[PDB]
Amino acid sequence: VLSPADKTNVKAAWGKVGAHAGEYGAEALERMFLSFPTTKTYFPHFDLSHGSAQVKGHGKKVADALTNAVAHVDDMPNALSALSDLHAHKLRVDPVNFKLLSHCLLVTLAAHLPAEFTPAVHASLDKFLASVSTVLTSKYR
Amino acid sequence: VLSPADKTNVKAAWGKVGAHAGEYGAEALERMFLSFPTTKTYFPHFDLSHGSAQVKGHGKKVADALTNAVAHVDDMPNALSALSDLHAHKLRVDPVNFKLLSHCLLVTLAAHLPAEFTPAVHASLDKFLASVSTVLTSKYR
Amino acid sequence: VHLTPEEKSAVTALWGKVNVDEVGGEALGRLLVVYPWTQRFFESFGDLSTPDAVMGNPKVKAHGKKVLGAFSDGLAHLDNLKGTFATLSELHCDKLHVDPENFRLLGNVLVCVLAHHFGKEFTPPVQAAYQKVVAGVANALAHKYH
Amino acid sequence: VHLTPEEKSAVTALWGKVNVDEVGGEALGRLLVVYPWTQRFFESFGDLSTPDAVMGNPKVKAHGKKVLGAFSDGLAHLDNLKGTFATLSELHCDKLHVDPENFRLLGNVLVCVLAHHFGKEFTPPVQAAYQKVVAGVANALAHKYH
Numbered sequence: 001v002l003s004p005a006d007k008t009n010v011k012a013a014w015g016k017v018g019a020h021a022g023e024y025g026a027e028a029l030e031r032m033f034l035s036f037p038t039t040k041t042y043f044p045h046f047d048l049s050h051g052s053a054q055v056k057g058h059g060k061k062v063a064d065a066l067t068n069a070v071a072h073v074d075d076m077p078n079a080l081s082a083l084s085d086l087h088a089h090k091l092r093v094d095p096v097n098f099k100l101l102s103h104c105l106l107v108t109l110a111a112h113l114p115a116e117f118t119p120a121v122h123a124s125l126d127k128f129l130a131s132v133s134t135v136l137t138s139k140y141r
Numbered sequence: 142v143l144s145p146a147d148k149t150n151v152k153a154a155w156g157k158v159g160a161h162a163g164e165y166g167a168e169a170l171e172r173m174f175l176s177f178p179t180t181k182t183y184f185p186h187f188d189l190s191h192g193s194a195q196v197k198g199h200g201k202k203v204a205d206a207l208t209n210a211v212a213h214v215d216d217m218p219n220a221l222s223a224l225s226d227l228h229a230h231k232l233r234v235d236p237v238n239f240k241l242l243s244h245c246l247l248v249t250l251a252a253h254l255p256a257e258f259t260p261a262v263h264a265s266l267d268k269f270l271a272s273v274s275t276v277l278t279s280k281y282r
Numbered sequence: 283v284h285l286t287p288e289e290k291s292a293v294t295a296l297w298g299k300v301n302v303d304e305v306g307g308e309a310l311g312r313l314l315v316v317y318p319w320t321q322r323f324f325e326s327f328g329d330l331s332t333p334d335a336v337m338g339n340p341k342v343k344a345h346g347k348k349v350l351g352a353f354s355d356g357l358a359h360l361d362n363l364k365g366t367f368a369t370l371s372e373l374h375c376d377k378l379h380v381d382p383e384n385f386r387l388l389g390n391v392l393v394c395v396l397a398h399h400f401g402k403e404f405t406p407p408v409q410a411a412y413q414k415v416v417a418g419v420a421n422a423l424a425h426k427y428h
Numbered sequence: 429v430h431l432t433p434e435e436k437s438a439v440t441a442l443w444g445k446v447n448v449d450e451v452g453g454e455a456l457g458r459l460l461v462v463y464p465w466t467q468r469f470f471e472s473f474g475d476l477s478t479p480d481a482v483m484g485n486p487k488v489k490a491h492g493k494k495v496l497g498a499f500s501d502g503l504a505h506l507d508n509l510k511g512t513f514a515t516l517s518e519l520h521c522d523k524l525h526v527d528p529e530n531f532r533l534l535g536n537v538l539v540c541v542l543a544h545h546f547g548k549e550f551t552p553p554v555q556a557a558y559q560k561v562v563a564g565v566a567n568a569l570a571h572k573y574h
C-alpha cells in the first residue's frame with residue numbers, strides 16, 4: 001500500500017528517467033541476467049549476450065510498462081491486467097524473480113540518479129516495485 | 142490482488158466460522174506462539190500461558206478484525222488503517238511473522254472446517270491473508 | 283535440526299497413522315494450486331489448468347507419493363536430515379534451481395494437509411513438533427545452497 | 429565464494445575507494461528506513477523517528493562502520509566465510525533471532541549504496557561480483573540457522 005508521499009516520490013524520481021527509459025530498462029535487465037544467472041531460463045529464446053538488441057528492445061518495453069504503472073498508480077490491477085495475464089497466467093514467473101529485478105532497477109536508478117535516490121525515495125520505489133510485482137504475479141481475473 | 146472467485150470463497154468460508162471466531166483466533170495465536178516462539182517477543186507483557194484469558198480476548202480481537210476485513214475486502218486499506226498504524230508504525234512487526242500467523246490460521250481452519258477447506262478455498266484464504274498482511278505491515282499514511 | 287525427545291515421539295506417533303498413498307498427492311496438488319508459479323516446474327505432467335484438474339492428475343498423485351516417501355525417510359532419520367536429503371538437494375538446487383522458499387511452502391502445505399486430515403488430533407504441540415520437521419527438511423534440501 | 433581473478437581485481441579496486449566512515453552507516457541507515465521493522469532491533473540507538481534522523485544518527489553511523497568492517501574481513505577471507513563469521517552468526521542467530529531474509533536485504537542495500545556512491549563505475553559486471561560476495565556473507569551469518 002502506497003502512501004500519498006510514496007506516490008509523489010515515485011513520480012518525481014521515475015520522471016527523471018525520461019528518455020533514458022530504454023537505457024535504464026536494458027541495464028536493469030543486464031544487471032539481473034549477470035548477477036542472477038537463473039533468471040535467464042525465462043528467456044531461452046532470447047539473445048542474452050551483452051549489448052544484445054533483443055534485450056535493448058525488451059528493456060524499453062519494461063521501462064515503458066513501469067511508466068504506465070506510475071501513471072495509473074491508483075488502479076494498477078486494472079492498468080496492468082494484460083501483464084498479469086502474461087507473467088502470472090502464462091509465464092508462471094516465480095515471485096523471487098521479481099524481487100531480483102526490482103533490486104536491479106533500484107541499483108540502476110541509484111547509479112544514474114544519485115540526487116533522486118534519497119533514503120525516503122529509495123523506500124517508496126521499493127514499495128512501488130513490490131506492488132507492481134504483486135500485481136504481475138497474481139491471478140485475479 | 143484477489144479475483145472475484147477468491148472474494149466469493151473467502152466470504153463463504155469465513156462466514157462458516159461465525160460464532161467460533163474468537164475460538165479459532167485464540168487457537169491460531171496459541172499455535173503460532175508454540176510453533177514459532179520468537180513471535181512471543183511481540184507480547185512481552187502478555188499472559189501467554191495455555192488457556193489464558195488474555196490470549197482468548199486477543200484471539201477474538203484478531204478474529205473480528207478479519208471479519209471486518211472480509212466485509213471490506215474491496216476497501217481494506219481504509220477499513221484497516223488503524224490496524225496498519227498499530228502493526229506497521231508502532232509495533233514495526235516483521236512481515237515474516239504475518240506469514241506465520243496466516244499459516245496458523247489456515248491450519249486452524251483446516252482442523253475445524255474439513256469440508257470447507259478445499260484446495261480452491263485454501264488458495265483463496267491464503268491470498269486474502271497475504272493481502273491483509275501487506276496492508277498491516279505497510280505505512281500508507 | 284532440533285527436536286526434543288517428546289517432539290520426536292509425537293511426530294513418529296502421528297506419522298504412523300498417515301495414509302502414504304494420499305497425503306503426498308494432496309500436498310503436491312495443493313502446492314500447485316495455492317502457489318500457481320510452482321506449476322512451471324511440472325510442465326510435462328499434463329493438465330494443471332484448474333484445481334480439479336490438478337488434484338485429479340495421476341502424475342501429481344504418483345509424484346506426491348515419491349515426495350511423501352522422502353518425508354518418511356527423513357522422519358526415520360531426524361538426527362541426520364542433511365545426509366538423508368543430500369542427493370535430493372543436488373537435484374532441486376543444482377539441477378532444477380528451485381528457489382528454497384518453495385521448500386518452506388511445500389512444508390507448510392503438508393502441515394495444512396495434516397491438520398485437515400487429523401483435525402482436533404493435530405494439536406498445537408503436535409503442529410509445533412512438525413514445524414521443526416518440515417523446517418529441517420526444507421533446510422536439508424537447500425543445503426546445496428549453503 | 430567463487431570469484432574469477434578478474435572479478436577479484438574489480439572488487440578490490442572498488443572497495444579500496446570505499447569511504448569507511450560513511451558507507452556502512454548509509455547501508456544500515458537505508459535498511460532501517462526501507463524496512464522499518466528492522467528498527468525494532470536498534471531500540472537503544474535513540475532517535476529513528478524519521479529518515480534524516482536515522483541517517484544522521486551517530487549510533488547508526490558508528491554501528492554501520494562495524495558492519496562495513498565485517499564485510500571487509502569477509503572480502504579478506506572469501507575461502508572461509510563460515511569460520512570468519514562463526515561468532516557473528518551465533519550472535520545474530522541464537523541471540524538476536526534475526527530472520528535470514530533480513531541478512532539478504534542488508535546485503536542488497538549495501539549493493540545499492542555502492543551503486544549510489546560510484547555511479548557509472550558500479551557496472552553490471554562489478555555488481556555481479558559483489559552479489560556473490562554479499563550472498564556468501566549473508567549465508568555465513570545464517571549458518572548457525574542451518
Ligand code: HEM
Pocket residue numbers: 039042043061062065066083086087091093097098099101129132133136
Ligand atoms: C517490474 C517487473 C516487470 C515488468 C514491469 C515487466 C514488463 C514486461 C513487459 C512490458 C513485457 C512485454 C509484454 C508484451 O507487450 O508483449 C514483458 C515480457 C516478459 N517478461 Fe516481464 N516484466 C517484469 C518482470 C519480469 C520478471 C521478474 C521476469 C522473469 C525473470 C520476466 C519475464 C518476462 C518474459 C519471459 C517476457 C516475455 C518476453 C518475450 O518473449 O517477448 N518479467 N515483461
Ligand code: HEM
Pocket residue numbers: 180183184202203206207224227228232234238239240242243273274277
Ligand atoms: C491476520 C493478521 C493480524 C491481524 C488481523 C491482527 C489484528 C490485531 C488486532 C485487532 C489487535 C488489537 C488492536 C487494538 O487493540 O486496537 C492486534 C494487536 C496486536 N497485534 Fe496483531 N494482528 C495480526 C497479526 C499480528 C502479528 C503477526 C503480530 C506479531 C507476531 C501481531 C502483534 C500484535 C501486537 C503486539 C498487538 C498489541 C497487543 C497489546 O495489546 O499489547 N499481530 N492485532
Ligand code: HEM
Pocket residue numbers: 320323324348349352353370374378380384385386388389419420423
Ligand atoms: C520440500 C520437500 C520436497 C521433497 C522432500 C521433494 C522430494 C522429491 C522427490 C522424492 C523427487 C523424486 C526424485 C527422483 O527420483 O528423481 C522429487 C522430484 C522433483 N521435485 Fe521435489 N521435493 C520437495 C520440494 C519441491 C519443490 C518445492 C519443487 C518445486 C516447486 C519441487 C520440484 C521437483 C521436480 C520438478 C522434480 C522432478 C519431477 C520430474 O520427475 O519431472 N520439489 N522431489
Ligand code: HEM
Pocket residue numbers: 466467469470472494495498499516520524526530531532534535565566569
Ligand atoms: C548480513 C549482514 C550483517 C552483518 C555483516 C552484520 C554485522 C554486525 C557486526 C559486525 C556487529 C557488531 C558485533 C559486536 O560488536 O560484537 C553487529 C551487531 C548487531 N547486528 Fe548485525 N550484521 C548484519 C545483519 C544484521 C541485521 C539484518 C540485523 C537485524 C535487523 C542485525 C542486528 C544487529 C544488532 C541488534 C546488533 C547488536 C548491536 C548492539 O546493540 O550492540 N544485523 N552486526
Ligand SMILES: *Cc1cc(OC)ccc1OCc1ccccn1
Pocket residue numbers: 001002076077127130131132134135142275279
Ligand atoms: C501496497 C503493497 C506493498 C507491498 O510491499 C510489501 C506489496 C504489494 C502491495 O500492493 C499491491 C496491490 C494490490 C491490490 C491493489 C493495488 N496494489
Ligand SMILES: *Cc1cc(OC)ccc1OCc1ccccn1
Pocket residue numbers: 001134138142143217218267268271272273275276
Ligand atoms: C492481492 C495480494 C496478494 C499478495 O500475495 C499473495 C500480497 C498482497 C496483495 O494485496 C494487498 C492489497 C494492497 C492494496 C489494496 C488491496 N490489497
